[PDB]
Amino acid sequence: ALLSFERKYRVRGGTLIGGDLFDFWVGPFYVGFFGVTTAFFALLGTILIFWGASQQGTFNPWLINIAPPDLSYGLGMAPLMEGGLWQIITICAIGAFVSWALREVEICRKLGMGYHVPFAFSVAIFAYVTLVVFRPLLMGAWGHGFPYGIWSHLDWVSNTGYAYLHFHYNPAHMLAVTFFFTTTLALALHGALVLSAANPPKGEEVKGPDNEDTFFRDFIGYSIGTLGIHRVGLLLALNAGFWSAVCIIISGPVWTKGWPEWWNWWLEMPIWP
Amino acid sequence: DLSFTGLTDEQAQELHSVYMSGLWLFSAVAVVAHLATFIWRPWF
Amino acid sequence: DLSFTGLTDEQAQELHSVYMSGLWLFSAVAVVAHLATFIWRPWF
Amino acid sequence: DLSFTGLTDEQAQELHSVYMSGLWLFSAVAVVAHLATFIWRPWF
Amino acid sequence: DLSFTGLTDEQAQELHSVYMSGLWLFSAVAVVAHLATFIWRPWF
Amino acid sequence: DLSFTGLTDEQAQELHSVYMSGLWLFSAVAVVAHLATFIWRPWF
Amino acid sequence: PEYQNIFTQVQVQGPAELGVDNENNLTEERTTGTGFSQLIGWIGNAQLGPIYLGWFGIISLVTGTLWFNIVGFNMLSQVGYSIPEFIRQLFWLALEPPSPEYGLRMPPLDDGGWFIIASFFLLVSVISWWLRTYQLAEMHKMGKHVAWAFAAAIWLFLVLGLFRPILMGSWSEAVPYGIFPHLDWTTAFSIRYGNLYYNPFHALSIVFLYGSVLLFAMHGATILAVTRFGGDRELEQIYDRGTASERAGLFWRWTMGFNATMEGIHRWAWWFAVLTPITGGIGILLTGTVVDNWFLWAVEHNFAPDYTQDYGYEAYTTYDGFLGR
Amino acid sequence: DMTCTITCWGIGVLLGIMTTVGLMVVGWSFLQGAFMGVLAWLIVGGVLAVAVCGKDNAEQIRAEMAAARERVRGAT
Amino acid sequence: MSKFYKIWLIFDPRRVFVAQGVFLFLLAAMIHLVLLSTEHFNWFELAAANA
Amino acid sequence: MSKFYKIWLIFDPRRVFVAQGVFLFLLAAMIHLVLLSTEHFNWFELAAANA
Amino acid sequence: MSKFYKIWLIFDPRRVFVAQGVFLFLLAAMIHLVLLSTEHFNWFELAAANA
Amino acid sequence: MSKFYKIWLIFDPRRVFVAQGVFLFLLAAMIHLVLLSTEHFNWFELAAANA
Amino acid sequence: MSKFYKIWLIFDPRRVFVAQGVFLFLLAAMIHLVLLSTEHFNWFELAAANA
Amino acid sequence: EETFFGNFDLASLSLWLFYGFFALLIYYLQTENMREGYPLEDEDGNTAANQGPFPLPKEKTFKLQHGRGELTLPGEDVQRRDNLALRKTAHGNGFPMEPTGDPMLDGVGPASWSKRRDVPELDAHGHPKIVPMSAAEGFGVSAGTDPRGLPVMAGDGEIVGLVSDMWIDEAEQLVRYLELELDPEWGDGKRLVQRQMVRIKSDRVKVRSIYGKHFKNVPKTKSPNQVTLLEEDKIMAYYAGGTLYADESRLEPQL
Ligand code: BCL
Ligand SMILES: CC[C@H]1c2cc3[nH]c4c(c3C)C(=O)[C@H](C(=O)OC)c4c3nc(cc4[nH]c(cc(n2)[C@@H]1C)c(C(C)=O)c4C)[C@@H](C)[C@@H]3CCC(=O)OC/C=C(/C)CCC[C@H](C)CCC[C@H](C)CCCC(C)C
Ligand SMILES: CC[C@H]1c2cc3[nH]c4c(c3C)C(=O)[C@H](C(=O)OC)c4c3nc(cc4[nH]c(cc(n2)[C@@H]1C)c(C(C)=O)c4C)[C@@H](C)[C@@H]3CCC(=O)OC/C=C(\C)CCC[C@H](C)CCC[C@H](C)CCCC(C)C
Ligand SMILES: CC[C@H]1c2cc3[nH]c4c(c3C)C(=O)[C@H](C(=O)OC)c4c3nc(cc4[nH]c(cc(n2)[C@@H]1C)c(C(C)=O)c4C)[C@@H](C)[C@@H]3CCC(=O)OC/C=C(\C)CCC[C@H](C)CCC[C@H](C)CCCC(C)C
Ligand SMILES: CCCCCCCC/C=C\CCCCCCCC(=O)O[C@H](COC(=O)CCCCCCCCCCCCCCCCC)COP(=O)(O)OC[C@@H](O)CO
Ligand SMILES: CCCCCCCC/C=C\CCCCCCCC(=O)O[C@H](COC(=O)CCCCCCCCCCCCCCCCC)COP(=O)(O)OC[C@@H](O)CO
Ligand SMILES: CCCCCCCC/C=C\CCCCCCCC(=O)O[C@H](COC(=O)CCCCCCCCCCCCCCCCC)COP(=O)(O)OC[C@@H](O)CO
Ligand SMILES: COC(C)(C)C(=O)C/C=C(\C)CC/C=C(\C)CC/C=C(\C)CCCC/C(C)=C/CCC(C)CC/C=C(\C)CCC=C(C)C
Ligand SMILES: COC(C)(C)C(=O)C/C=C(\C)CC/C=C(\C)CC/C=C(\C)CCCC/C(C)=C/CCC(C)CC/C=C(\C)CCC=C(C)C
Ligand SMILES: COC(C)(C)C(=O)C/C=C(\C)CC/C=C(\C)CC/C=C(\C)CCCC/C(C)=C/CCC(C)CC/C=C(\C)CCC=C(C)C
Ligand SMILES: COC(C)(C)C(=O)C/C=C(\C)CC/C=C(\C)CC/C=C(\C)CCCC/C(C)=C/CCC(C)CC/C=C(\C)CCC=C(C)C
Ligand SMILES: COC(C)(C)C(=O)C/C=C(\C)CC/C=C(\C)CC/C=C(\C)CCCC/C(C)=C\CCC(C)CC/C=C(\C)CCC=C(C)C
Ligand SMILES: [Fe+3]
């Protein structure tokens, strides 16, 4: 079923690979070459997760846990029950994510739009590959990755932060938290402003951009504008994900001691008496 | 005559007459329930 | 002749009378309740 | 006569009289309550 | 006459006379209050 | 004359003359205050 | 490559805008005087000012500056009025809440009295800025969405500083005023009550924070890709649908099977952002007052994982083998 | 003249790199020398993009503009 | 007292009825739960005690 | 006192009725809970100790 | 003093009345809570310890 | 000192009345808190000890 | 010295009056707090110690 | 603290109450976003058998400014195109469509426009919002490189004309369109380019989307001083369609 205005946009062409061999739709979904690779990888990963859950002994969604191997295996392959299933599922997940991005690229090409959305999704892919491939390779063992479990991947986060004593004192984690909080404050403000412009009190007329610019200069003395706010939101979100990846890749391979001690360079600067 | 809702005096009278009939039935059922509970397990 | 809401003087008198009836009913019920409570368990 | 709100001198004289009538009632109730609290549990 | 607000000399004189009557009432009460607190609990 | 505020020479003399008379009152109270405190508790 | 629309190619400047008006006469309280910044104009608007000055804003500014100076002067006096040491240890100093032995009574000025006086001035300042945000919509004849979104965060602010200390029975439960000292409070609060990961409302707050950041990446990117069809003029797209809204909707419909409208995406954004402090405050209000150990609560309610292997380094290696000896 | 501003910011970046290496030869550690290098960059490169790039070219044009500003005042 | 019906001239019945219904059910459920939380008025444990 | 009816020439009854209802219910609930939180005035625990 | 009525020629009664109501309720609630945080002036503990 | 009424020919009489009221309350509130932070001047604690 | 009145032909009195008032109170409050922060000039502790 | 029954305490009650509230909120949010594009249709223009799990919302009204009237949604589709030169490539649903003639001239595919109102957008004072710079009192280039007078190069490397003016949005102080005068060899008259489709350099202005031979068929405005919303949509869609239809190699797989 189509929307009232959708039929004129459903034309042929704009594929990276495959031509018209996969150029069709299933329901609302578009399929192409990267829609077939996404389906295969995602289904294989989910089926393997549930087979591992059956072999573990519990089907409770809270308690399912598939874990990486021991550190003694290094960068080699472990037996499938002692951590090899985690490696296979990691490969499947990487394939699925890359196929999802390349499918978004083809949809953008067909609609004649810019390629901003796949580029933004590439940042989240980079933060995940840093956690399961880059830090583990640098540190020398696949067993440094986090496990695949709803409540067991929080234990990993807790133990990894106390391994550097007081994680709040990590300089690049402080930058990343600030970016997260600022994105949420700006999203709230933007949504509120647009809704308040489009929904006035009963018996009144709707408002325009002039009114929105004026309210914000009256409130705080500045207005970024209707085009600037989207650029700023995108930049804030992408900066949040990039700094998160940095905070984790320096904690292991670059710094070994507690994070408070790193601040000693400021406390013993020669200028101080 | 004052009206912030759009109804007239007679419509409001009829609506209130219907409303109080249900309020009294609810109150009577609650009163009977509260009496049996005191005879079984007193609270004062 | 002053008015900020749009009501006239006579409408305001009529609204105030009904409001005072309700207030006196509520206050009487509360007074009886407080008297019973003080007899049951005193606080002064 | 100077007036920022829009009221006239007579309207202001009537409103202030009513306001003071309410204020005294409030203060007269507050006084009796403070005397009883002092006979019951005196500070100073 | 120099004027930034819009008032005249007589209007300012009258406003000031009523303002100073309230300054003195507030301040006389404060004086009595301060005198009773020292007799009770001297500071200095 | 040079006026960036649009007041005249005499209006300026009037404002200043009034301003200094409050300045002197402020300074006088403060000196009686400092004197009482040095006699109460010297700091030199 | 094609132009991407992150930086403006050429800027144009004209007479400064002073704002719209109606019968409420907003011009009387607006300052006169504006500026222009060409550095900012590469991204957004270049005009600076003017601003509106009511009584709520003035009171908020005065009482917030007072709070700042009581804290700053207390911090300066704690160090002996030594300016170079004041600069050296700025991130480490704080104004500490009272000691637990005083309960909810008024503590000595050396042990939390200045903390309570300064907390009363910050409270007054914050509630005044909110009354200003409500009044300006009312004066501009707009909706009150901004004030409601601000009150959502004020709810968690008040829970952290006012409500929970009163329900717990001590002013000592409040947060200190410092950079590092306040982060130590967060870690100590998490440790004292078990593990805050296992508080379900903390998990819900994390869910909504993650969701709000994912949505500005998606919404910002989507709006920047349809700017070649006039997509940044959102209000007129709401009042008269154009091809930008159609393409933006169809992208997500073909991607994940459902989509939104031009007006309706902002409701999604408003709710995810608003829901973070509400769930966070509900989670904080239940700690100590109801639940004292969240990991034991998780064990009771059966969502705590179990591990089979052993603990200890000598279950996996040898001290000599870890040194290369 | 946005091209002179970017040049001036790059000379600031280069002075910052030199400040780090110089303090390290004299006895300071990397991070101590790099905080000072960042401030040299931001203070000096900023100062030069206001002062040097604000001595914009104009020659008798500069003169007349200034002699006419000197006519705005006098009746202001 | 005899003119309370004019409450429907100030308030909209459609909103009032929904608010009432939600309030009444929530109050009843809370009261039943509070009674169940005690030791003298829990009727499920009294049946076990009396057997 | 005879002229206190003129409150309605200043305040809108629609807003104050809702505000008064919310205020009254919240105040009553708070007082009942505060009484339940004490030791001498908890009436559920008194029945358990008088039986 | 007999011309204090002119305070209504400067201040709007609506804003003054709303602010006064909020201020009075908040002040009374605050005063009632400080008395309960002390030992000598809590009336519930007094009743508990009198019996 | 006899021409101090000209302050009203410089400042608006509504602006001054709002600021003066707010300032005076907040100053009286803070002094009471400073007296109660002490031991010699906290009157609630002295009534208990004179007992 | 006799031509100091001319500051009012350069500076607007309305702005400087507000600026002065704010500056004056903030200076006075800071001296009292510094005095309160010392061991010899805290007049509240003297009353407790003296008697 | 005690439990009501079993392990049920105050935290559990709060959690379940939030569960119920969130379910109702999800229902409200999904229903609010169905005011455009419904009911669903099949590939032949008939109403589809399936309409989904959520019913449609009730009606809202918007009071517009400057006497434009009222808007009630959900309602009939007033932006619908009438005669589209498209052909089905299959007998059922789920397959693409093929253009019948020239896709760029027929406004289909990535060149599709929506039938908007045939009036310009107004500002707060009731005046057209986008105005050529030669008629805008007080505006000047304050930063960047001024493109007026520079030649314009197409996507295949041909010079087609010169930039004559700029069209600006005065309320928001932003450039919206560039005005190009064509050489006689490449057409006649003046055309517009939206700002987001050009790259301004020191000696040229580059438009990569279309080629030189496509510059004569860009839609033209009726008045030389104002542009309506419909013309804006047709001009922007024409340039957007060239990213796919300018060359046959842009439509085939890139591999
Ligand atoms: C050891 C550390 C503990 C921990 C301890 C805590 C504690 C303790 C708390 C959080 C809380 C939060 N935690 Mg946690 N948290 C941990 C680990 C994590 C991790 C992770 C490992 O990845 C994440 C993503 C988070 C994330 C979060 C947020 C979801 C949440 C804050 C909500 C919010 O709205 O914030 C944004 C902040 C605000 C809205 C504050 C309000 C700000 C006010 C309104 C400002 C007023 C204006 C101001 C005074 C003026 C300034 C001056 C101006 C310039 C004029 N936590 C671990 C387990 N977490 C909070 C929560 O809600 O818990 C449920 C909380 O209190
Ligand atoms: C979360 C959003 C934050 C924010 C942002 C914000 N506020 C701003 C700005 C920004 C980005 C400005 O650019 C603008 C400003 O000019 O600040 C100096 C401003 C402003 N926000 C203000 C108020 C304000 N903002 C507040 C809040 C906030 N605004 C938050 C902290 C608050 C509080 C307490 O909540 C207040 C009270 C003023 C300080 C100021 C109001 C603007 C004004 O009055 O401008 C008058 C015009 C001028 C002539 C001054 C401009 C300075 C130069 C002489 C002009 C030439 C420009 C130069 C080339 C560059 C310098 C400008 C720099 C800011 C880059
Ligand atoms: C600035 C970076 C932010 C970001 C950006 C981003 N993400 C995006 C996008 C963008 C711009 C999209 O366009 C895209 C999208 O389509 O969104 C609807 C997406 C997306 N990001 C998502 C989620 C997501 N984003 C997150 C965060 C973020 N993404 C950042 C905040 C998070 C977290 C943890 O905070 C999550 C969970 C998806 C909803 C979505 C598209 C991903 C997708 O569908 O990929 C295809 C894969 C499948 C359908 C299933 C794969 C199955 C695997 C083979 C097996 C599973 C293994 C897995 C590793 C187990 C993990 C267990 C856990 C309990 C630990
Ligand atoms: C929905 C939850 C999110 C959220 C939303 C949110 N915040 C908000 C709002 C909203 C909707 C506002 O409307 C309000 C606002 O004004 O935004 C511009 C605000 C606001 N949220 C703020 C902070 C804030 N919000 C946070 C969190 C969040 N707010 C969440 C992410 C956080 C954290 C910890 O993450 C912070 C730190 C403020 C910027 C502002 C509230 C303004 C306020 O109340 O200010 C009181 C003012 C004073 C303290 C007096 C001034 C004294 C100053 C110390 C100095 C002078 C002022 C000067 C302008 C600053 C110094 C700069 C110099 C160069 C001059
Ligand atoms: C608390 C500070 C104030 C206390 C003293 C107030 C009374 C003093 C006397 C007079 C001033 C009162 C107002 C009279 C005048 C009314 C109308 C008017 O005119 O002014 C109004 C009046 O504004 C105010 O009075 C501002 C008060 C703001 C205080 C907010 C502090 C937070 C609240 C509570 C925190 C504590 C609770 C914690 C627990 C709970 C948890 C929160 C603004 O309207 P406007 O239109 O902007 O005015 C411009 C003007 O020129 C138009 O002509
Ligand atoms: C248990 C079930 C899921 C399986 C378990 C594993 C995955 C769990 C994670 C996420 C689930 C997301 C699944 C969404 C997939 C939608 C597929 C789709 O496309 O479904 C549409 C119908 O859906 C929709 O219309 C949108 C549904 C909401 C989207 C997700 C919201 C996430 C909100 C919050 C974050 C969630 C975190 C939890 C907070 C816990 C809180 C206590 C059919 O098409 P339609 O045309 O749109 O029909 C509708 C209309 O038009 C009729 O005509
Ligand atoms: C390819 C390999 C897959 C990858 C394998 C990985 C497994 C997990 C991945 C994805 C799971 C999602 C699968 C569902 C997608 C169904 C496809 C679809 O949607 O197909 C539609 C058919 O609709 C449906 O089938 C309706 C689905 C209902 C959604 C539920 C709504 C709430 C749901 C959630 C709320 C969340 C809250 C919290 C949660 C906890 C609480 C739930 C065709 O649509 P149509 O013909 O255009 O029109 C018809 C249209 O209107 C509606 O009938
Ligand atoms: C112990 O401490 C704690 C905190 C635990 C407490 O429990 C404290 C509790 C309280 C303080 C509780 C307070 C409770 C109340 C004040 C409750 C009040 C309840 C009511 C007023 C209930 C009213 C019910 C009315 C009903 C049921 C009326 C009508 C019902 C109908 C079905 C009829 C309606 C139909 C109509 C009108 C048809 C329309 C007619 C036309 C003519 C169109
Ligand atoms: C221990 O200390 C702590 C902090 C715990 C406290 O508990 C402190 C508590 C306080 C300080 C409490 C203070 C409490 C008050 C000041 C309470 C005040 C209460 C009232 C003023 C109550 C008023 C009630 C009025 C009522 C019930 C009116 C009812 C009216 C009607 C039911 C209907 C009448 C109107 C109609 C029908 C409209 C007619 C329409 C027309 C068009 C004519
Ligand atoms: C221990 O120390 C701490 C800090 C804890 C404190 O507690 C310190 C406390 C303080 C410093 C407290 C200070 C308190 C005050 C200054 C209190 C002041 C109180 C008042 C001035 C109260 C006034 C009350 C007035 C009232 C109730 C008036 C009512 C009026 C009416 C009901 C009449 C309404 C008028 C009408 C309808 C006019 C109609 C006319 C027309 C023409 C329409
Ligand atoms: C931190 O240090 C510690 C803690 C020690 C301190 O506490 C330090 C404290 C200070 C440094 C405090 C300093 C305090 C001051 C400077 C206080 C000053 C106070 C005043 C000047 C008060 C003035 C009060 C005036 C009053 C109440 C006037 C009232 C007037 C009226 C009610 C009448 C007004 C009505 C009019 C005019 C109507 C006429 C209208 C017409 C239209 C004709
Ligand atoms: C001396 O040098 C000068 C003059 C330049 C200065 O002034 C320097 C100043 C500084 C260097 C200042 C530095 C300040 C900081 C580093 C401040 C940091 C502040 C925080 C992180 C504050 C957090 C505050 C609060 C939090 C986390 C939560 C909740 C708080 C509240 C709700 C507070 C409200 C309190 C209430 C309601 C209690 C009031 C009490 C009553 C009895 C009403
Ligand atoms: Fe938007």
Automatic annotation (TrEMBL), chain A:
Transmembrane segments: 29-53, 84-102, 114-134, 174-198, 232-255
Alphabetically ordered keywords of this record: Bacteriochlorophyll, Chlorophyll, Chromophore, Electron transport, Iron, Magnesium, Membrane, Metal-binding, Photosynthesis, Reaction center, Transmembrane, Transmembrane helix, Transport
UniProt membrane topology term: Multi-pass membrane protein
Record InterPro entries: Photo_II_D1/D2_sf, Photo_RC_L, Photo_RC_L/M, Photo_RC_L/M_CS
GO CC annotation terms, alphabetical: plasma membrane light-harvesting complex; plasma membrane-derived chromatophore membrane
Sequence positions that bind bacteriochlorophyll a 1: H153
GO biological process, one term: photosynthetic electron transport in photosystem II
Family, as annotated: Belongs to the reaction center PufL/M/PsbA/D family.
Identification of the protein by name: Reaction center protein L chain
Name of encoding gene: pufL
UniProtKB/TrEMBL annotation, chains B, C, D, E, F:
Protein location: Cell inner membrane
KW Cell inner membrane (keyword) present: yes
Main localisation: membrane
Every Antenna complex alpha/beta subunit domain range: 9-44
This protein's GO CC annotations: plasma membrane; plasma membrane light-harvesting complex
Transmembrane domains' residue ranges: 18-40
PROSITE patterns, alphabetized: ANTENNA_COMP_BETA
Protein function: Antenna complexes are light-harvesting systems, which transfer the excitation energy to the reaction centers.
Family as reported in the entry's similarity comment: Belongs to the antenna complex beta subunit family.
The protein's name in its UniProt record: Antenna pigment protein beta chain
Native source species: Dinoroseobacter shibae (strain DSM 16493 / NCIMB 14021 / DFL 12)
Automatic annotation (TrEMBL), chain H:
SS bond list: C4-C53
The organism's place on the tree of life at top rank: Bacteria
Protein keywords: Membrane, Transmembrane, Transmembrane helix
TM helices/strands, residue ranges: 6-28, 34-53
Protein name per Swiss-Prot or TrEMBL: Uncharacterized protein
Organism whose genome encodes this protein: Dinoroseobacter shibae (strain DSM 16493 / NCIMB 14021 / DFL 12)
Automatic annotation (TrEMBL), chain N:
PRC-barrel domain mapped to chain residues: 141-212
GO CC, any one term: plasma membrane light-harvesting complex
Coiled-coil ranges (or none): none
Chain ranges of the Photosynthetic reaction centre H subunit N-terminal domain: 3-134
Lineage of the species this protein comes from: Bacteria, Pseudomonadati, Pseudomonadota, Alphaproteobacteria, Rhodobacterales
Protein name listed in UniProt: Reaction center protein H chain
Keyword Transmembrane helix recorded: yes
Organism: Dinoroseobacter shibae (strain DSM 16493 / NCIMB 14021 / DFL 12)
UniProt entry tagged with the keyword Protein biosynthesis: no
Transmembrane segments: 11-29
Keywords in alphabetical order: Membrane, Transmembrane, Transmembrane helix
UniProt-listed GO biological process terms: photosynthesis, light reaction
